[PDB]
Each structure stands twice: as structure tokens, then as C-alpha cells.
Amino acid sequence: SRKKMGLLVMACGTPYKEEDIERYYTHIRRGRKPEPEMLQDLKDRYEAIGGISPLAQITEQQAHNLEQHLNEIQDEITFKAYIGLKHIEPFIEDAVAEMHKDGITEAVSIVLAPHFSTFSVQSYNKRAKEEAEKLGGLTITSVESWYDEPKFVTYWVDRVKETYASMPEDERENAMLIVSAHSLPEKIKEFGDPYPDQLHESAKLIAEGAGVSEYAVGWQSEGNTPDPWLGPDVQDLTRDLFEQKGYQAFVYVPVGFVADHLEVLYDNDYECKVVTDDIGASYYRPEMPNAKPEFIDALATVVLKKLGRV
Ligand SMILES: *Cc1c(C)c(=O)n2c(=O)c(C)c(C)n12
Ligand SMILES: [Cl-]
Ligand SMILES: [Cl-]
Ligand SMILES: [Cl-]
Ligand SMILES: [Cl-]
Ligand SMILES: [Cl-]
Ligand SMILES: [Mg+2]
Ligand SMILES: [Mg+2]
Ligand SMILES: [Mg+2]
Ligand code: NI
Ligand code: NI
């Protein structure tokens, strides 16, 4: 009756407990174990943002709710979700091997990052497809980007509108919206990587839908290699825009991220908040989509559009 398909949901991964910080960051650092002071600092950061455990549940909740919602809203396909992570188990290759073992022959994949880049999305999709080729008997159709799905734009538009509506009059008249994603090396431009263009278009679409005429695009969370990374960084951008025009409120939409993790709860809600507190501006950062129903319905529409079924 219903056609069976795998639903491969890919994400960065998180530690599952404090004793996973060493192995998770060693993998991010390409085999270089963090020094003891860095391990201690990371433990402190996770404690300050409320703990690791809640963060580690979000991708699983996203994948489970997406599977169930997709199976309810149409009658042709029965999806089974499999989670594949970049930096901790279950890895991408573990998920594809499990699909193969379970008898899946046809799958659709989606990365829980809305903008395509050559560093992340393309690498996830290539890893998944290479593992399927090695095992045989299984093919994967991969979503490449989805930042322009109207239901996803509307998620952020409605959160921005609520934040502006909640402001005092003086803030509402002297506010700045900063839309951001995770920085990458500038060298991606040598490949024509559309990641920067897609961030700028996300920003255009969200500001336009919310009616916000004053906005800026920034980057966050750059690494420390000697080569230049995409900027400006959100901390510098905030201070610069303040020094130019004296905004009384900054609103942060880190549209490249879809789930609470350190790079939002720390790199925005601590590091950007340090800057806004220092300059006397109010700080707002609306909620990440996490596994909320409005977001799950946007993802389900992305998948069904990719398969040509809506
Ligand atoms: C890979 C990744 C994403 C998407 C994210 O939000 N975070 C973090 O907060 C860390 C520490 C890492 C890695 N990631
Ligand atoms: Cl791809
Ligand atoms: Cl696509
Ligand atoms: Cl794309
Ligand atoms: Cl919100
Ligand atoms: Cl919702
Ligand atoms: Mg313990
Ligand atoms: Mg597209
Ligand atoms: Mg940093
Ligand atoms: Ni720009
Ligand atoms: Ni990072």
C-alpha cells in the first residue's frame, strides 16, 4: 500500500553528558584534544546555559516529530526517521548503515541547516551518498537548501513582529535587526559557494515580511585559522552600528541555526548581550524553532516539495 522511505535527518551533533565534551571537541578540532583549561571552560559554558542534556534532545525530537507529521499529512509514503550526526554518534555513516540493515531502499535526506554551503551541507550529503554507494541497494535524494521555504520565513517573520510589538516606543523607533549565520572561511568564494548570498536573501525576506526597514547581516562563531573568515562578526557589528547611529535595541535572528546549542545560547545570549549591556541597549533574541509544530510543518513541506508531491 504505502511506499516505505527512509528520512535521513542530519545535524552537527552535541555531547550527551559532560564527559563527552573531550571527544566531541577533539572531533571538531580534527584530532587535536583540547587543553585542560579549554575543557574546564567548556564545561563552565554548558553549565551557564542550563546544561548539556536538554540540548542533546532537540535533534531527536525534531526527527521524531517530523516523521510523525509527514506520515499524518499525506497518505502515499510511510517515512522512518534516522539521525545522522557530523561530530558524535550516531554518525552519518551509522545512520545509512542502519537504513540498509532495516531494508530501506529509497530515502530522502535533509540537513537541519537552511543554507547550502560547500563546507557543511554539501559535505553531509556527499558522506551519506558515498556510504549508500558502498553498501549498495539504497539511493538518497538530498535537500540542498530550504531557507526560502515560505513557511520557514514566516516562522521568523512572526517572531520578529512580536518582538518589535513588545518594545517601548523609543526602542521600536531606534532598533536594529541583525540577521546572522555561522561564519566560514572567505576562501569558499573561490568555489562560488552561495552561502553568503543565501544568508543575505534570508535577511531580506525576514525583514521584508516583518516590515523592518533597518537591518544588517553579520556572521558569528568563526574559527581561529589564519585565513580570513566571513565578517563582520556580530559582536563588532553591534558596536559599530551603535557608534554610528546610537540604536537603543538590538534584535538578533541567528537564522542559520535551528536549535539551541552553545553557538546561540552563548555566542548570542552571552557574547552579544555583553556588548548590548555595555552600550546600554536592550537585547532581544527570539526563540529558536527547535521542535515547535510550526517549524515541523515547514520542514515537512520542504521534504514533500523535494519529492514533487506538493
Ligand atoms: C555544528 C554546530 C552547530 C550547528 C551549533 O549550533 N553548534 C554549537 O553550538 C557547537 C559547539 C557546534 C560544533 N555546533
Ligand atoms: Cl549537496
Ligand atoms: Cl533542494
Ligand atoms: Cl542551494
Ligand atoms: Cl520568541
Ligand atoms: Cl508552533
Ligand atoms: Mg558525570
Ligand atoms: Mg532551492
Ligand atoms: Mg567564538
Ligand atoms: Ni552584506
Ligand atoms: Ni562552530
Side-chain angles (χ1 to χ4, degrees), residues 95-133:
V96 175
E98 196 181 2
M99 288 200 296
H100 190 271
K101 177 175 117 132
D102 292 346
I104 299 293
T105 64
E106 185 181 337
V108 57
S109 72
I110 188 166
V111 184
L112 294 180
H115 310 100
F116 181 86
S117 67
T118 57
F119 170 87
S120 57
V121 175
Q122 187 182 54
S123 177
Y124 281 96
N125 291 346
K126 167 184 195 273
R127 278 172 67 180
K129 282 174 184 174
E130 288 185 342
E131 185 68 19
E133 183 180 5

Short mmCIF file of all heavy atoms in Angstrom, two decimals, residues 95-133:
data_model
loop_
_atom_site.label_atom_id
_atom_site.label_comp_id
_atom_site.label_asym_id
_atom_site.label_seq_id
_atom_site.Cartn_x
_atom_site.Cartn_y
_atom_site.Cartn_z
N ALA A 95 23.94 5.95 10.37
CA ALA A 95 22.53 6.06 10.00
C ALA A 95 22.27 5.39 8.67
O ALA A 95 21.25 4.67 8.53
CB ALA A 95 22.11 7.53 9.93
N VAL A 96 23.14 5.59 7.68
CA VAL A 96 22.93 4.96 6.39
C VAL A 96 23.07 3.45 6.50
O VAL A 96 22.26 2.70 5.91
CB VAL A 96 23.88 5.59 5.36
CG1 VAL A 96 23.77 4.84 4.01
CG2 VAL A 96 23.57 7.05 5.19
N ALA A 97 24.03 2.96 7.31
CA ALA A 97 24.17 1.51 7.51
C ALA A 97 22.93 0.93 8.19
O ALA A 97 22.48 -0.18 7.84
CB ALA A 97 25.45 1.17 8.31
N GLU A 98 22.36 1.65 9.14
CA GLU A 98 21.12 1.16 9.78
C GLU A 98 19.96 1.11 8.80
O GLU A 98 19.16 0.17 8.83
CB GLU A 98 20.74 1.97 11.02
CG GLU A 98 19.70 1.18 11.88
CD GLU A 98 19.22 1.89 13.14
OE1 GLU A 98 19.63 3.03 13.42
OE2 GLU A 98 18.38 1.28 13.86
N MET A 99 19.78 2.16 7.99
CA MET A 99 18.76 2.13 6.93
C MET A 99 18.93 0.91 6.04
O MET A 99 17.95 0.18 5.76
CB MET A 99 18.82 3.41 6.09
CG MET A 99 18.33 4.65 6.77
SD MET A 99 17.87 6.02 5.65
CE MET A 99 19.44 6.46 4.86
N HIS A 100 20.16 0.63 5.62
CA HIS A 100 20.41 -0.52 4.75
C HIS A 100 20.04 -1.80 5.48
O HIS A 100 19.31 -2.65 4.94
CB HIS A 100 21.89 -0.53 4.34
CG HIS A 100 22.20 -1.51 3.26
ND1 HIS A 100 22.54 -2.82 3.53
CD2 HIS A 100 22.17 -1.39 1.92
CE1 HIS A 100 22.73 -3.46 2.39
NE2 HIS A 100 22.52 -2.61 1.39
N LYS A 101 20.46 -1.93 6.74
CA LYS A 101 20.18 -3.14 7.52
C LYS A 101 18.68 -3.37 7.68
O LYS A 101 18.21 -4.53 7.67
CB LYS A 101 20.82 -3.02 8.90
CG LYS A 101 20.53 -4.20 9.84
CD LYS A 101 21.31 -4.07 11.15
CE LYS A 101 20.38 -3.94 12.34
NZ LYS A 101 20.78 -4.88 13.42
N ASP A 102 17.91 -2.31 7.88
CA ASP A 102 16.46 -2.37 8.09
C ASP A 102 15.68 -2.63 6.80
O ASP A 102 14.45 -2.70 6.86
CB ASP A 102 15.92 -1.10 8.74
CG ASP A 102 16.39 -0.90 10.17
OD1 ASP A 102 16.91 -1.88 10.78
OD2 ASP A 102 16.21 0.25 10.69
N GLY A 103 16.34 -2.70 5.65
CA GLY A 103 15.67 -2.95 4.40
C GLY A 103 15.16 -1.73 3.66
O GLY A 103 14.43 -1.88 2.69
N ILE A 104 15.57 -0.52 4.06
CA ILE A 104 15.24 0.70 3.29
C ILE A 104 15.99 0.65 1.96
O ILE A 104 17.18 0.35 1.92
CB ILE A 104 15.69 1.93 4.08
CG1 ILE A 104 14.99 2.06 5.43
CG2 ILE A 104 15.53 3.20 3.23
CD1 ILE A 104 13.53 2.33 5.35
N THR A 105 15.28 0.97 0.85
CA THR A 105 15.93 1.05 -0.47
C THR A 105 15.88 2.45 -1.08
O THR A 105 16.57 2.69 -2.08
CB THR A 105 15.33 0.03 -1.46
OG1 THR A 105 13.95 0.34 -1.68
CG2 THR A 105 15.40 -1.36 -0.81
N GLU A 106 15.06 3.34 -0.53
CA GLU A 106 14.85 4.68 -1.07
C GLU A 106 14.70 5.61 0.11
O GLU A 106 13.93 5.33 1.04
CB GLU A 106 13.59 4.68 -1.96
CG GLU A 106 13.31 5.96 -2.70
CD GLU A 106 12.01 5.84 -3.54
OE1 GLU A 106 11.61 4.70 -3.88
OE2 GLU A 106 11.42 6.88 -3.85
N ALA A 107 15.45 6.71 0.12
CA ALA A 107 15.41 7.66 1.23
C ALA A 107 15.45 9.08 0.69
O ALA A 107 15.94 9.35 -0.43
CB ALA A 107 16.60 7.44 2.17
N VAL A 108 14.98 10.00 1.51
CA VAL A 108 15.15 11.44 1.29
C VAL A 108 15.90 11.98 2.49
O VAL A 108 15.68 11.52 3.61
CB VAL A 108 13.79 12.16 1.11
CG1 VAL A 108 12.83 11.94 2.33
CG2 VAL A 108 14.01 13.65 0.83
N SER A 109 16.84 12.90 2.25
CA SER A 109 17.61 13.47 3.36
C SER A 109 17.40 14.98 3.45
O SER A 109 17.11 15.67 2.45
CB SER A 109 19.12 13.16 3.24
OG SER A 109 19.72 13.91 2.18
N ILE A 110 17.57 15.49 4.67
CA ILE A 110 17.52 16.92 4.93
C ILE A 110 18.52 17.22 6.03
O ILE A 110 18.63 16.47 7.02
CB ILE A 110 16.08 17.42 5.28
CG1 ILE A 110 16.01 18.95 5.35
CG2 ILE A 110 15.55 16.67 6.53
CD1 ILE A 110 14.64 19.54 5.36
N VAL A 111 19.31 18.29 5.84
CA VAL A 111 20.21 18.83 6.86
C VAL A 111 19.46 19.90 7.62
O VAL A 111 18.80 20.78 7.03
CB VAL A 111 21.52 19.38 6.23
CG1 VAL A 111 22.49 19.85 7.36
CG2 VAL A 111 22.15 18.31 5.41
N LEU A 112 19.59 19.87 8.94
CA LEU A 112 18.91 20.85 9.81
C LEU A 112 19.76 22.12 9.90
O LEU A 112 20.23 22.54 10.96
CB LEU A 112 18.62 20.22 11.16
CG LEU A 112 17.62 19.08 11.14
CD1 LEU A 112 17.43 18.55 12.59
CD2 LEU A 112 16.30 19.52 10.47
N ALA A 113 19.98 22.73 8.72
CA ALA A 113 20.67 24.00 8.49
C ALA A 113 20.10 24.52 7.17
O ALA A 113 20.19 23.80 6.16
CB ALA A 113 22.17 23.78 8.30
N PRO A 114 19.44 25.68 7.13
CA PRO A 114 18.66 26.04 5.93
C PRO A 114 19.46 26.53 4.74
O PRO A 114 18.90 26.53 3.64
CB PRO A 114 17.72 27.13 6.44
CG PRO A 114 18.41 27.72 7.69
CD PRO A 114 19.14 26.53 8.29
N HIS A 115 20.71 26.93 4.92
CA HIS A 115 21.52 27.45 3.81
C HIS A 115 22.52 26.41 3.34
O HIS A 115 23.20 25.75 4.14
CB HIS A 115 22.29 28.69 4.28
CG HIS A 115 21.43 29.71 4.96
ND1 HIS A 115 21.37 29.82 6.34
CD2 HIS A 115 20.58 30.66 4.48
CE1 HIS A 115 20.50 30.77 6.67
NE2 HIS A 115 20.04 31.31 5.56
N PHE A 116 22.63 26.31 2.01
CA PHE A 116 23.67 25.45 1.44
C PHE A 116 25.05 26.08 1.65
O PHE A 116 25.23 27.29 1.47
CB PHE A 116 23.46 25.30 -0.08
CG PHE A 116 24.46 24.42 -0.76
CD1 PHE A 116 24.26 23.06 -0.82
CD2 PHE A 116 25.61 24.97 -1.34
CE1 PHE A 116 25.19 22.24 -1.48
CE2 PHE A 116 26.53 24.17 -2.02
CZ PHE A 116 26.33 22.81 -2.06
N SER A 117 26.04 25.24 2.00
CA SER A 117 27.45 25.64 1.82
C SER A 117 28.24 24.41 1.43
O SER A 117 27.80 23.27 1.62
CB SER A 117 28.07 26.25 3.07
OG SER A 117 28.18 25.25 4.08
N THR A 118 29.42 24.67 0.82
CA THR A 118 30.35 23.58 0.47
C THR A 118 31.00 22.95 1.69
O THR A 118 31.45 21.80 1.59
CB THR A 118 31.46 24.10 -0.48
OG1 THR A 118 32.15 25.18 0.13
CG2 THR A 118 30.92 24.57 -1.80
N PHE A 119 31.04 23.63 2.83
CA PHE A 119 31.71 23.09 4.00
C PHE A 119 30.83 22.16 4.79
O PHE A 119 31.30 21.14 5.32
CB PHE A 119 32.24 24.23 4.92
CG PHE A 119 32.74 23.74 6.29
CD1 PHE A 119 34.05 23.31 6.46
CD2 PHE A 119 31.88 23.69 7.41
CE1 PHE A 119 34.50 22.87 7.70
CE2 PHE A 119 32.33 23.25 8.65
CZ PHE A 119 33.63 22.83 8.79
N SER A 120 29.55 22.50 4.93
CA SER A 120 28.66 21.71 5.78
C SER A 120 27.72 20.90 4.91
O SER A 120 27.99 19.72 4.64
CB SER A 120 27.87 22.62 6.71
OG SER A 120 27.13 23.56 5.95
N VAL A 121 26.61 21.52 4.45
CA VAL A 121 25.57 20.76 3.75
C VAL A 121 26.16 19.84 2.66
O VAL A 121 25.84 18.65 2.60
CB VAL A 121 24.49 21.68 3.16
CG1 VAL A 121 23.51 20.87 2.35
CG2 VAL A 121 23.68 22.38 4.28
N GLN A 122 26.99 20.39 1.74
CA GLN A 122 27.46 19.53 0.65
C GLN A 122 28.27 18.35 1.21
O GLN A 122 28.14 17.23 0.71
CB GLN A 122 28.38 20.38 -0.23
CG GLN A 122 28.82 19.70 -1.49
CD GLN A 122 29.76 20.59 -2.29
OE1 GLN A 122 30.78 21.08 -1.78
NE2 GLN A 122 29.40 20.84 -3.51
N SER A 123 29.03 18.57 2.27
CA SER A 123 29.83 17.50 2.87
C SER A 123 28.95 16.44 3.52
O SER A 123 29.23 15.24 3.40
CB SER A 123 30.83 18.08 3.87
OG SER A 123 31.56 17.04 4.51
N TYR A 124 27.88 16.85 4.23
CA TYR A 124 26.93 15.88 4.80
C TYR A 124 26.32 15.01 3.69
O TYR A 124 26.23 13.78 3.82
CB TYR A 124 25.77 16.64 5.46
CG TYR A 124 25.92 17.28 6.85
CD1 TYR A 124 26.25 18.62 7.00
CD2 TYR A 124 25.57 16.56 8.01
CE1 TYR A 124 26.34 19.22 8.27
CE2 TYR A 124 25.64 17.15 9.27
CZ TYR A 124 26.02 18.46 9.40
OH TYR A 124 26.10 19.04 10.66
N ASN A 125 25.85 15.67 2.61
CA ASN A 125 25.14 14.94 1.56
C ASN A 125 26.07 13.99 0.83
O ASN A 125 25.67 12.86 0.48
CB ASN A 125 24.49 15.91 0.56
CG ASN A 125 23.32 16.70 1.18
OD1 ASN A 125 22.87 16.31 2.25
ND2 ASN A 125 22.80 17.74 0.53
N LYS A 126 27.30 14.43 0.58
CA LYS A 126 28.27 13.55 -0.07
C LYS A 126 28.61 12.35 0.82
O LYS A 126 28.71 11.23 0.30
CB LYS A 126 29.54 14.36 -0.41
CG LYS A 126 30.74 13.50 -0.80
CD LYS A 126 31.98 14.36 -1.03
CE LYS A 126 33.04 13.56 -1.77
NZ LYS A 126 33.91 12.76 -0.85
N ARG A 127 28.77 12.55 2.13
CA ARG A 127 29.07 11.43 3.04
C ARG A 127 27.93 10.40 3.00
O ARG A 127 28.16 9.18 2.91
CB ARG A 127 29.28 11.91 4.48
CG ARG A 127 30.71 12.47 4.79
CD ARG A 127 30.82 13.14 6.23
NE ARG A 127 30.69 12.20 7.36
CZ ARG A 127 30.75 12.53 8.65
NH1 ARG A 127 30.94 13.78 9.05
NH2 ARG A 127 30.61 11.58 9.57
N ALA A 128 26.68 10.89 3.08
CA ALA A 128 25.54 9.98 3.07
C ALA A 128 25.49 9.19 1.76
O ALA A 128 25.28 7.95 1.76
CB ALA A 128 24.28 10.82 3.25
N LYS A 129 25.69 9.87 0.62
CA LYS A 129 25.58 9.19 -0.66
C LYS A 129 26.71 8.19 -0.86
O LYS A 129 26.49 7.10 -1.42
CB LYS A 129 25.55 10.20 -1.82
CG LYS A 129 24.14 10.86 -1.97
CD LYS A 129 24.13 11.98 -3.03
CE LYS A 129 22.78 12.67 -3.11
NZ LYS A 129 22.91 13.82 -4.04
N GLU A 130 27.93 8.56 -0.44
CA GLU A 130 29.06 7.64 -0.56
C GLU A 130 28.84 6.38 0.28
O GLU A 130 29.15 5.26 -0.17
CB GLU A 130 30.35 8.36 -0.15
CG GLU A 130 30.79 9.37 -1.19
CD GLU A 130 32.13 10.02 -0.87
OE1 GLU A 130 32.58 9.97 0.30
OE2 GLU A 130 32.72 10.59 -1.80
N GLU A 131 28.28 6.52 1.49
CA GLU A 131 28.02 5.32 2.27
C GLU A 131 26.96 4.45 1.61
O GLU A 131 27.09 3.20 1.57
CB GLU A 131 27.61 5.66 3.71
CG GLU A 131 27.44 4.42 4.65
CD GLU A 131 28.73 3.68 4.97
OE1 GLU A 131 29.81 4.29 4.79
OE2 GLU A 131 28.63 2.51 5.40
N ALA A 132 25.89 5.07 1.07
CA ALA A 132 24.88 4.28 0.36
C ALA A 132 25.48 3.52 -0.83
O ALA A 132 25.11 2.36 -1.06
CB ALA A 132 23.75 5.20 -0.11
N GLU A 133 26.35 4.17 -1.59
CA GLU A 133 27.04 3.52 -2.73
C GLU A 133 27.89 2.34 -2.24
O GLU A 133 27.88 1.26 -2.86
CB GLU A 133 27.87 4.58 -3.48
CG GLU A 133 28.58 4.05 -4.75
CD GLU A 133 29.40 5.11 -5.50
OE1 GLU A 133 29.54 6.26 -5.02
OE2 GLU A 133 29.93 4.77 -6.59
#
